[PDB]
Amino acid sequence: DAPESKLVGRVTYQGQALNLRGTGEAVQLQLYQDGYEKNDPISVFVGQDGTFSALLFDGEYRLTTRDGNGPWVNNHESVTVNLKGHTEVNLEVTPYFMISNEQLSVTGSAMNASFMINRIVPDAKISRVMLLLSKTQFADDVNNLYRQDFSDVVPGSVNLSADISGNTEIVKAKALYARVGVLANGADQAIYSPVVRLK
Ligand SMILES: [Cl-]
Ligand SMILES: [Cl-]
Ligand SMILES: [Mg+2]
């Protein structure tokens, strides 16, 4: 009916893609269009690696975060998109925390996780830190085979060990993936490390 094109994008911080919950419509962005035709915003769901893709009608769009949704300041961050042919964009946000220098491993007895939690927003506080394992490439606070929360972690160097002994599902798993998550006080979603395949 009208020219259509693929829009590909990423949510980033200082140009680096964010690691998020990419399942269950956990993290969404909105695409707005201003014109005669009173077009409602289009919802786009962000993946685990912070990417999104949409087949849309060619035109001018305003890509923004959804109010109060995501592990970042509720600043209504936005970017103008001129969609004509295959187009790629990024959207800069301000995360509460960033996870870096991750070292994730499993023994027969424990999941060991060493990493750094960097505070980006000066008054942000950590609500919980999560150690996760999954049988699949998808791992998050809902989608996992094993989850252990830590509620007294502060920013800086972190060294955690979660007891996975006696967990038959981990022993049975043909493939095993690990991830860590950090949820800020007042946020609806955590920030994560990349998913690491352990077996
Ligand atoms: Cl062992
Ligand atoms: Cl569990
Ligand atoms: Mg901005």
PDB file of C-alpha atoms and ligand atoms in Angstrom:
ATOM      1  CA  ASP A   1       0.000   0.000   0.000  1.00  0.00           C
ATOM      2  CA  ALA A   2       2.965   2.339   0.832  1.00  0.00           C
ATOM      3  CA  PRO A   3       6.853   2.207   0.824  1.00  0.00           C
ATOM      4  CA  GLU A   4       8.140   0.146   3.811  1.00  0.00           C
ATOM      5  CA  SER A   5      11.594  -0.280   5.332  1.00  0.00           C
ATOM      6  CA  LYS A   6      13.448  -2.068   8.114  1.00  0.00           C
ATOM      7  CA  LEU A   7      14.442   0.068  11.120  1.00  0.00           C
ATOM      8  CA  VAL A   8      17.185  -1.487  13.307  1.00  0.00           C
ATOM      9  CA  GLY A   9      18.387   0.005  16.535  1.00  0.00           C
ATOM     10  CA  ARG A  10      20.117  -0.293  19.899  1.00  0.00           C
ATOM     11  CA  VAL A  11      19.695   1.298  23.319  1.00  0.00           C
ATOM     12  CA  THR A  12      23.191   2.445  24.382  1.00  0.00           C
ATOM     13  CA  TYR A  13      25.273   4.189  27.038  1.00  0.00           C
ATOM     14  CA  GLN A  14      28.386   6.048  25.735  1.00  0.00           C
ATOM     15  CA  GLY A  15      27.883   4.125  22.472  1.00  0.00           C
ATOM     16  CA  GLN A  16      27.842   0.615  24.108  1.00  0.00           C
ATOM     17  CA  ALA A  17      24.694  -1.601  23.809  1.00  0.00           C
ATOM     18  CA  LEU A  18      22.984  -2.368  27.107  1.00  0.00           C
ATOM     19  CA  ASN A  19      22.288  -5.920  28.307  1.00  0.00           C
ATOM     20  CA  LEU A  20      18.584  -6.168  29.287  1.00  0.00           C
ATOM     21  CA  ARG A  21      15.679  -8.533  29.891  1.00  0.00           C
ATOM     22  CA  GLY A  22      14.699  -9.341  26.320  1.00  0.00           C
ATOM     23  CA  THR A  23      11.595 -11.459  27.094  1.00  0.00           C
ATOM     24  CA  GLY A  24       7.932 -10.952  28.107  1.00  0.00           C
ATOM     25  CA  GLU A  25       7.782  -7.344  26.736  1.00  0.00           C
ATOM     26  CA  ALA A  26       9.914  -6.334  29.773  1.00  0.00           C
ATOM     27  CA  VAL A  27      11.587  -3.342  28.016  1.00  0.00           C
ATOM     28  CA  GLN A  28       9.834  -1.206  25.398  1.00  0.00           C
ATOM     29  CA  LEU A  29      10.501   1.890  23.328  1.00  0.00           C
ATOM     30  CA  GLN A  30       7.937   4.005  21.510  1.00  0.00           C
ATOM     31  CA  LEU A  31       7.952   5.358  17.940  1.00  0.00           C
ATOM     32  CA  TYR A  32       5.945   8.601  17.490  1.00  0.00           C
ATOM     33  CA  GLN A  33       4.837  10.295  14.261  1.00  0.00           C
ATOM     34  CA  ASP A  34       3.565  13.903  14.131  1.00  0.00           C
ATOM     35  CA  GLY A  35       1.118  14.583  11.264  1.00  0.00           C
ATOM     36  CA  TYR A  36      -2.534  15.044  10.014  1.00  0.00           C
ATOM     37  CA  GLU A  37      -3.150  11.310  10.584  1.00  0.00           C
ATOM     38  CA  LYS A  38      -3.339  11.137  14.413  1.00  0.00           C
ATOM     39  CA  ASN A  39      -0.981   8.144  14.622  1.00  0.00           C
ATOM     40  CA  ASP A  40      -0.759   6.384  18.017  1.00  0.00           C
ATOM     41  CA  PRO A  41       2.827   5.539  19.146  1.00  0.00           C
ATOM     42  CA  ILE A  42       4.174   2.184  17.862  1.00  0.00           C
ATOM     43  CA  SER A  43       5.618  -0.086  20.631  1.00  0.00           C
ATOM     44  CA  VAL A  44       8.974  -1.775  19.974  1.00  0.00           C
ATOM     45  CA  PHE A  45      10.299  -4.485  22.261  1.00  0.00           C
ATOM     46  CA  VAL A  46      14.023  -4.393  23.118  1.00  0.00           C
ATOM     47  CA  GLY A  47      16.019  -7.676  22.978  1.00  0.00           C
ATOM     48  CA  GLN A  48      18.561  -9.128  25.426  1.00  0.00           C
ATOM     49  CA  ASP A  49      21.472  -7.403  23.664  1.00  0.00           C
ATOM     50  CA  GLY A  50      19.574  -4.069  23.644  1.00  0.00           C
ATOM     51  CA  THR A  51      18.611  -4.263  19.945  1.00  0.00           C
ATOM     52  CA  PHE A  52      15.233  -3.760  18.284  1.00  0.00           C
ATOM     53  CA  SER A  53      13.942  -4.089  14.702  1.00  0.00           C
ATOM     54  CA  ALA A  54      10.713  -3.012  13.069  1.00  0.00           C
ATOM     55  CA  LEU A  55       9.243  -3.169   9.562  1.00  0.00           C
ATOM     56  CA  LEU A  56       7.639   0.270   9.203  1.00  0.00           C
ATOM     57  CA  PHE A  57       6.233   2.651   6.590  1.00  0.00           C
ATOM     58  CA  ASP A  58       8.874   5.095   5.344  1.00  0.00           C
ATOM     59  CA  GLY A  59       8.732   8.476   7.066  1.00  0.00           C
ATOM     60  CA  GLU A  60       9.945  10.600   9.982  1.00  0.00           C
ATOM     61  CA  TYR A  61       9.723   9.156  13.508  1.00  0.00           C
ATOM     62  CA  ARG A  62      10.587  10.080  17.073  1.00  0.00           C
ATOM     63  CA  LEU A  63      12.084   7.120  18.991  1.00  0.00           C
ATOM     64  CA  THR A  64      11.736   7.426  22.802  1.00  0.00           C
ATOM     65  CA  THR A  65      11.884   5.441  26.062  1.00  0.00           C
ATOM     66  CA  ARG A  66       8.605   4.449  27.764  1.00  0.00           C
ATOM     67  CA  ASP A  67       7.856   6.436  30.980  1.00  0.00           C
ATOM     68  CA  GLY A  68       9.377   4.699  34.053  1.00  0.00           C
ATOM     69  CA  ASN A  69      10.395   1.573  32.068  1.00  0.00           C
ATOM     70  CA  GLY A  70      14.028   0.389  32.075  1.00  0.00           C
ATOM     71  CA  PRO A  71      17.161   0.365  34.298  1.00  0.00           C
ATOM     72  CA  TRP A  72      17.786   4.068  33.519  1.00  0.00           C
ATOM     73  CA  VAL A  73      16.782   7.616  34.619  1.00  0.00           C
ATOM     74  CA  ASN A  74      13.176   8.459  33.670  1.00  0.00           C
ATOM     75  CA  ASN A  75      14.337  11.396  31.462  1.00  0.00           C
ATOM     76  CA  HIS A  76      12.152  10.617  28.361  1.00  0.00           C
ATOM     77  CA  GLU A  77      15.324  10.287  26.194  1.00  0.00           C
ATOM     78  CA  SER A  78      14.548  10.577  22.456  1.00  0.00           C
ATOM     79  CA  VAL A  79      16.127  10.531  18.931  1.00  0.00           C
ATOM     80  CA  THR A  80      14.702  11.601  15.511  1.00  0.00           C
ATOM     81  CA  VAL A  81      14.630   8.814  12.880  1.00  0.00           C
ATOM     82  CA  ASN A  82      14.329   9.539   9.132  1.00  0.00           C
ATOM     83  CA  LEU A  83      13.295   6.123   7.771  1.00  0.00           C
ATOM     84  CA  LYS A  84      14.029   5.777   4.026  1.00  0.00           C
ATOM     85  CA  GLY A  85      15.380   2.369   3.007  1.00  0.00           C
ATOM     86  CA  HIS A  86      17.185   0.140   5.545  1.00  0.00           C
ATOM     87  CA  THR A  87      18.020   2.512   8.479  1.00  0.00           C
ATOM     88  CA  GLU A  88      19.962   2.081  11.743  1.00  0.00           C
ATOM     89  CA  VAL A  89      19.835   4.288  14.846  1.00  0.00           C
ATOM     90  CA  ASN A  90      20.925   4.257  18.493  1.00  0.00           C
ATOM     91  CA  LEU A  91      19.177   5.731  21.527  1.00  0.00           C
ATOM     92  CA  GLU A  92      21.345   7.108  24.402  1.00  0.00           C
ATOM     93  CA  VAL A  93      20.026   6.647  27.950  1.00  0.00           C
ATOM     94  CA  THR A  94      21.475   7.159  31.478  1.00  0.00           C
ATOM     95  CA  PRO A  95      21.607   3.796  33.325  1.00  0.00           C
ATOM     96  CA  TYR A  96      21.578   3.825  37.175  1.00  0.00           C
ATOM     97  CA  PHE A  97      24.404   1.227  37.191  1.00  0.00           C
ATOM     98  CA  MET A  98      26.768  -0.501  34.765  1.00  0.00           C
ATOM     99  CA  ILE A  99      28.231  -4.012  35.231  1.00  0.00           C
ATOM    100  CA  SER A 100      31.779  -4.634  33.943  1.00  0.00           C
ATOM    101  CA  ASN A 101      34.794  -7.039  34.215  1.00  0.00           C
ATOM    102  CA  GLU A 102      32.476 -10.083  34.668  1.00  0.00           C
ATOM    103  CA  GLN A 103      33.952 -13.484  35.446  1.00  0.00           C
ATOM    104  CA  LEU A 104      31.203 -16.142  35.707  1.00  0.00           C
ATOM    105  CA  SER A 105      31.822 -19.839  36.316  1.00  0.00           C
ATOM    106  CA  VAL A 106      30.306 -22.979  37.851  1.00  0.00           C
ATOM    107  CA  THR A 107      31.773 -25.849  39.854  1.00  0.00           C
ATOM    108  CA  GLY A 108      29.829 -28.897  41.078  1.00  0.00           C
ATOM    109  CA  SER A 109      29.014 -26.958  44.301  1.00  0.00           C
ATOM    110  CA  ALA A 110      28.719 -23.249  43.353  1.00  0.00           C
ATOM    111  CA  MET A 111      28.185 -20.487  40.825  1.00  0.00           C
ATOM    112  CA  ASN A 112      31.087 -18.034  41.256  1.00  0.00           C
ATOM    113  CA  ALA A 113      30.671 -14.451  40.002  1.00  0.00           C
ATOM    114  CA  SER A 114      33.260 -11.670  40.261  1.00  0.00           C
ATOM    115  CA  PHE A 115      32.451  -8.294  38.646  1.00  0.00           C
ATOM    116  CA  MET A 116      32.372  -4.529  39.089  1.00  0.00           C
ATOM    117  CA  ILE A 117      29.234  -2.453  39.716  1.00  0.00           C
ATOM    118  CA  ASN A 118      29.768   1.139  38.626  1.00  0.00           C
ATOM    119  CA  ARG A 119      27.313   3.766  39.909  1.00  0.00           C
ATOM    120  CA  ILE A 120      26.386   6.154  37.038  1.00  0.00           C
ATOM    121  CA  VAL A 121      23.565   8.150  38.761  1.00  0.00           C
ATOM    122  CA  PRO A 122      24.905   9.809  41.981  1.00  0.00           C
ATOM    123  CA  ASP A 123      21.895   9.114  44.230  1.00  0.00           C
ATOM    124  CA  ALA A 124      21.066   5.605  42.917  1.00  0.00           C
ATOM    125  CA  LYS A 125      21.048   2.660  45.346  1.00  0.00           C
ATOM    126  CA  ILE A 126      21.216  -1.090  44.648  1.00  0.00           C
ATOM    127  CA  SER A 127      17.976  -3.004  45.480  1.00  0.00           C
ATOM    128  CA  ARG A 128      19.309  -6.484  44.580  1.00  0.00           C
ATOM    129  CA  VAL A 129      22.014  -8.358  42.683  1.00  0.00           C
ATOM    130  CA  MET A 130      21.033 -11.625  40.950  1.00  0.00           C
ATOM    131  CA  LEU A 131      23.122 -14.664  39.941  1.00  0.00           C
ATOM    132  CA  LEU A 132      21.349 -16.552  37.141  1.00  0.00           C
ATOM    133  CA  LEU A 133      21.716 -19.785  35.173  1.00  0.00           C
ATOM    134  CA  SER A 134      19.650 -20.914  32.182  1.00  0.00           C
ATOM    135  CA  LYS A 135      19.447 -24.039  29.916  1.00  0.00           C
ATOM    136  CA  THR A 136      18.902 -21.635  26.948  1.00  0.00           C
ATOM    137  CA  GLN A 137      20.458 -18.470  25.405  1.00  0.00           C
ATOM    138  CA  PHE A 138      17.767 -16.486  27.301  1.00  0.00           C
ATOM    139  CA  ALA A 139      18.517 -15.671  30.960  1.00  0.00           C
ATOM    140  CA  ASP A 140      16.828 -13.038  33.136  1.00  0.00           C
ATOM    141  CA  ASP A 141      15.061 -12.531  36.523  1.00  0.00           C
ATOM    142  CA  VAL A 142      11.973 -14.524  35.223  1.00  0.00           C
ATOM    143  CA  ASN A 143      13.579 -16.822  32.612  1.00  0.00           C
ATOM    144  CA  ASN A 144      16.080 -19.039  34.322  1.00  0.00           C
ATOM    145  CA  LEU A 145      16.786 -22.502  35.775  1.00  0.00           C
ATOM    146  CA  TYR A 146      18.489 -21.068  38.909  1.00  0.00           C
ATOM    147  CA  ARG A 147      18.381 -17.666  40.612  1.00  0.00           C
ATOM    148  CA  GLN A 148      20.023 -16.437  43.821  1.00  0.00           C
ATOM    149  CA  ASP A 149      19.519 -12.848  45.074  1.00  0.00           C
ATOM    150  CA  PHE A 150      21.915 -10.771  47.241  1.00  0.00           C
ATOM    151  CA  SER A 151      20.301  -7.722  48.930  1.00  0.00           C
ATOM    152  CA  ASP A 152      23.228  -6.007  50.729  1.00  0.00           C
ATOM    153  CA  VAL A 153      25.615  -5.296  47.779  1.00  0.00           C
ATOM    154  CA  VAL A 154      27.005  -1.768  47.277  1.00  0.00           C
ATOM    155  CA  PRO A 155      28.859  -0.330  44.173  1.00  0.00           C
ATOM    156  CA  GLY A 156      32.473  -1.409  43.626  1.00  0.00           C
ATOM    157  CA  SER A 157      34.137  -4.832  43.325  1.00  0.00           C
ATOM    158  CA  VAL A 158      31.741  -7.737  43.939  1.00  0.00           C
ATOM    159  CA  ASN A 159      32.650 -11.402  44.781  1.00  0.00           C
ATOM    160  CA  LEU A 160      29.657 -13.790  45.083  1.00  0.00           C
ATOM    161  CA  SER A 161      29.172 -17.562  45.412  1.00  0.00           C
ATOM    162  CA  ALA A 162      25.729 -19.135  45.071  1.00  0.00           C
ATOM    163  CA  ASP A 163      25.166 -22.694  46.313  1.00  0.00           C
ATOM    164  CA  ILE A 164      23.985 -24.782  43.321  1.00  0.00           C
ATOM    165  CA  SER A 165      24.667 -28.193  45.017  1.00  0.00           C
ATOM    166  CA  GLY A 166      21.778 -30.690  44.949  1.00  0.00           C
ATOM    167  CA  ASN A 167      20.156 -28.768  42.013  1.00  0.00           C
ATOM    168  CA  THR A 168      19.374 -31.671  39.598  1.00  0.00           C
ATOM    169  CA  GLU A 169      18.217 -29.368  36.746  1.00  0.00           C
ATOM    170  CA  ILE A 170      21.741 -27.789  36.463  1.00  0.00           C
ATOM    171  CA  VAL A 171      23.422 -31.297  36.447  1.00  0.00           C
ATOM    172  CA  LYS A 172      20.873 -32.489  33.749  1.00  0.00           C
ATOM    173  CA  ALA A 173      21.227 -29.389  31.500  1.00  0.00           C
ATOM    174  CA  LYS A 174      22.839 -30.153  28.064  1.00  0.00           C
ATOM    175  CA  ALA A 175      23.736 -26.457  27.696  1.00  0.00           C
ATOM    176  CA  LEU A 176      24.266 -23.925  30.470  1.00  0.00           C
ATOM    177  CA  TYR A 177      24.283 -20.116  30.295  1.00  0.00           C
ATOM    178  CA  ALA A 178      25.117 -17.608  33.056  1.00  0.00           C
ATOM    179  CA  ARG A 179      24.207 -13.975  33.670  1.00  0.00           C
ATOM    180  CA  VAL A 180      24.259 -11.417  36.466  1.00  0.00           C
ATOM    181  CA  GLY A 181      21.691  -8.671  37.123  1.00  0.00           C
ATOM    182  CA  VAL A 182      21.602  -5.408  39.121  1.00  0.00           C
ATOM    183  CA  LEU A 183      18.285  -3.765  40.056  1.00  0.00           C
ATOM    184  CA  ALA A 184      18.236  -0.141  41.318  1.00  0.00           C
ATOM    185  CA  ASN A 185      15.895   1.131  44.086  1.00  0.00           C
ATOM    186  CA  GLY A 186      12.795   2.561  42.387  1.00  0.00           C
ATOM    187  CA  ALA A 187      13.403   0.912  38.974  1.00  0.00           C
ATOM    188  CA  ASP A 188      11.050  -1.597  37.286  1.00  0.00           C
ATOM    189  CA  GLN A 189      13.835  -3.499  35.425  1.00  0.00           C
ATOM    190  CA  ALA A 190      17.423  -4.586  36.057  1.00  0.00           C
ATOM    191  CA  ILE A 191      20.605  -4.074  33.966  1.00  0.00           C
ATOM    192  CA  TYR A 192      22.524  -7.259  33.205  1.00  0.00           C
ATOM    193  CA  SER A 193      25.882  -8.577  32.075  1.00  0.00           C
ATOM    194  CA  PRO A 194      26.033 -10.266  28.610  1.00  0.00           C
ATOM    195  CA  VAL A 195      24.894 -13.915  28.693  1.00  0.00           C
ATOM    196  CA  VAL A 196      27.957 -16.244  28.981  1.00  0.00           C
ATOM    197  CA  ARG A 197      27.788 -19.861  27.717  1.00  0.00           C
ATOM    198  CA  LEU A 198      29.438 -22.160  30.326  1.00  0.00           C
ATOM    199  CA  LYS A 199      28.659 -25.510  28.602  1.00  0.00           C
TER     200      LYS A 199
HETATM  201 CL    CL B   1      33.132 -29.317  42.278  1.00  0.00          CL
HETATM  202 CL    CL B   2      16.204 -21.052  41.708  1.00  0.00          CL
HETATM  203 MG    MG B   3      19.189  12.232  24.712  1.00  0.00          MG
END
